[PDB]
Design an enzyme around this catalytic site. Structure first.
Site, short mmCIF file in Angstrom:
data_model
loop_
_atom_site.label_atom_id
_atom_site.label_comp_id
_atom_site.label_asym_id
_atom_site.label_seq_id
_atom_site.Cartn_x
_atom_site.Cartn_y
_atom_site.Cartn_z
CG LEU B 45 -1.98 -1.09 1.27
CD1 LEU B 45 -2.70 -1.13 2.64
CD2 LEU B 45 -2.98 -0.88 0.14
N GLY B 48 8.24 3.30 2.88
CA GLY B 48 9.01 4.33 3.57
C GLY B 48 10.48 3.95 3.62
CG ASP B 162 6.17 13.27 8.55
OD1 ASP B 162 6.53 14.26 7.86
OD2 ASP B 162 6.31 12.10 8.16
CE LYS B 164 5.11 12.84 4.69
NZ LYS B 164 6.58 12.67 4.39
N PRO B 165 -0.22 15.79 3.31
CG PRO B 165 -1.08 17.14 1.59
CD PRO B 165 0.07 17.05 2.59
CG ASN B 167 2.39 10.98 6.76
OD1 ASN B 167 2.67 10.12 5.93
ND2 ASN B 167 3.31 11.56 7.53
CG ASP B 180 4.84 7.80 9.08
OD1 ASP B 180 5.41 7.45 10.14
OD2 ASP B 180 5.46 7.98 8.01
CB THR B 197 8.01 16.33 4.91
OG1 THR B 197 7.77 15.00 5.38
CG2 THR B 197 8.12 16.32 3.38
O1 LIG Z 1 -4.61 1.77 5.09
C1 LIG Z 1 -3.65 2.10 5.79
N1 LIG Z 1 -3.75 2.02 7.19
N2 LIG Z 1 -2.75 2.34 7.96
C2 LIG Z 1 -1.59 2.79 7.46
CL1 LIG Z 1 -0.31 3.20 8.52
C3 LIG Z 1 -1.41 2.92 6.08
C4 LIG Z 1 -0.20 3.38 5.56
C5 LIG Z 1 -0.04 3.51 4.18
C6 LIG Z 1 -1.08 3.16 3.32
C7 LIG Z 1 -2.29 2.69 3.85
C8 LIG Z 1 -2.46 2.57 5.23
#
Ligand SMILES: O=c1[nH]nc(Cl)c2ccccc12
Lengths: 20, 346
Positions: B45, B48, B162, B164-165, B167, B180, B197
């Site tokens: 998904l 990092g 942190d 930002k769009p 996150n 995050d 960032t």
């Molecule tokens: O659906 C998600 N849930 N939680 C996180 Cl950290 C996440 C982080 C990146 C992309 C998707 C997700």
């Protein structure tokens, strides 16, 4: 336009965190 | 913004109960609550520095989750041990509608794992770049959620660091969930770590000044600006050029920005800490009571009773259409334990 300048820049993708 | 009546006492009550709950878990963290083999790994998904987030399915329940995988050796090389311990210790202790929930954590010989609720609507980042910019009412809707989230986090002595769009995930109700916590820290008083960032760094971070929760409120200023304009207030091709813009004390607004929005942003993007909204005697109430937020019903926002700007497309469970595709990589678990001492409390 400022928008055009942004879109043509190298930082329109996901931006990484920095750490020092 | 200065008034202290019934409304402000209801907030205090809520925050007092919230801190009680948080401290119990902060002082006695949950640990080792699942195992890798209990999850079917489906698709990446996001990625990092230390690893990736993968969509997984929990075998025993059939629930989907987003599992963050960190390579212990890479965390060490990047000197992020304490930050990673912060992240997990804080995440397992907090509880708020607009924070992504940690469901399980565990570790094996090679990796650390944090299994989070899966938020299928994708990153705000994706939607924002595609549509260009949000209307002010839509930006206000999202911004209000971050205001409440920071009021919550800061009351627990947490700094997020942190925003930002990238996150901010959009859930199936069209609301935001913050992801995050890699730089989140519990601190009373000052801290000094150079992190975040580039586009979102407050001046005091760039100048190595020692700082506090006011950096989150500066970042909110950057976020609202980027949501409403379609681009950040300070951008360039290289970070150094971005920092020069940030410290200069100059900011320009799009001509379509309302005067109220510009006023709020001038007070958030304030280089002078003694003048920055969120950092004055009235605290967050200077923000909550600003004219730009006059139509915002803070309680209704918290209760998710306000109609969202949009509901993400949903093609059944497990669909990832709202996320970019990433190169897939097999999870390898060494036969030898790595960095055991460093991550013993995880
Ligand atoms: O659906 C998600 N849930 N939680 C996180 Cl950290 C996440 C982080 C990146 C992309 C998707 C997700």
């Amino acid at each position: 336009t400022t928008y055009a300048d942004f879109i043509a820049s190298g930082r329109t993708g996901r931006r990484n965190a920095i750490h020092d | 913004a200065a008034k202290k009546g019934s409304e402000q006492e209801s907030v205090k009550e809520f925050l007092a109960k919230a801190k009680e709950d948080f401290l119990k878990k902060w002082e006695s963290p949950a640990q080792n609550t699942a195992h890798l083999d209990q999850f079917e790994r489906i698709k990446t998904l996001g990625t990092g520095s230390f690893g990736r987030v993968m969509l997984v399915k929990h075998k025993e329940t059939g629930n989907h989750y987003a599992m963050k995988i960190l390579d212990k050796q890479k965390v060490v090389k990047l000197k992020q041990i304490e930050h990673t311990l912060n992240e997990k210790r804080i995440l397992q202790a907090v509880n708020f509608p607009f924070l992504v929930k940690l469901e399980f954590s565990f570790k094996d010989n090679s990796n650390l794992y944090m299994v989070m609720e899966y938020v299928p609507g994708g990153e705000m980042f994706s939607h924002l770049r595609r549509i260009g910019r949000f209307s002010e009412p839509h930006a206000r809707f999202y911004a209000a959620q971050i205001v409440l989230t920071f009021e919550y986090l800061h009351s627990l002595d947490l700094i997020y660091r942190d925003l930002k769009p990238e996150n901010l995930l959009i859930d199936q109700q069209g609301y935001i969930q913050v992801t995050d916590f890699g730089f989140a820290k519990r601190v009373k008083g000052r801290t000094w770590t150079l992190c975040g960032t580039p586009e979102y760094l407050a001046p005091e971070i760039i100048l190595s000044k020692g700082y506090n929760k006011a950096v989150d409120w500066w970042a909110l200023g950057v976020l609202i600006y980027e949501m409403a304009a379609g681009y950040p207030p300070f951008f360039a091709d290289q970070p150094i050029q971005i920092y020069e813009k940030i410290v200069s004390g100059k900011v320009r607004f799009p001509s379509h920005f309302s005067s109220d929005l510009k006023d709020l942003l001038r007070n958030l993007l304030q280089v002078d800490l003694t003048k920055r909204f969120g950092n004055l005697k009235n605290g967050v109430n200077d923000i909550k009571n600003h004219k730009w937020f006059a139509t915002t019903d803070w309680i209704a926002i918290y209760q998710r009773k306000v109609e969202a700007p949009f509901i993400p497309k949903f093609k059944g469970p497990g669909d990832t259409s709202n996320f970019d595709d990433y190169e897939e990589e097999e999870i390898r678990v060494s036969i030898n334990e790595k960095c055991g001492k460093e991550f013993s409390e995880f």
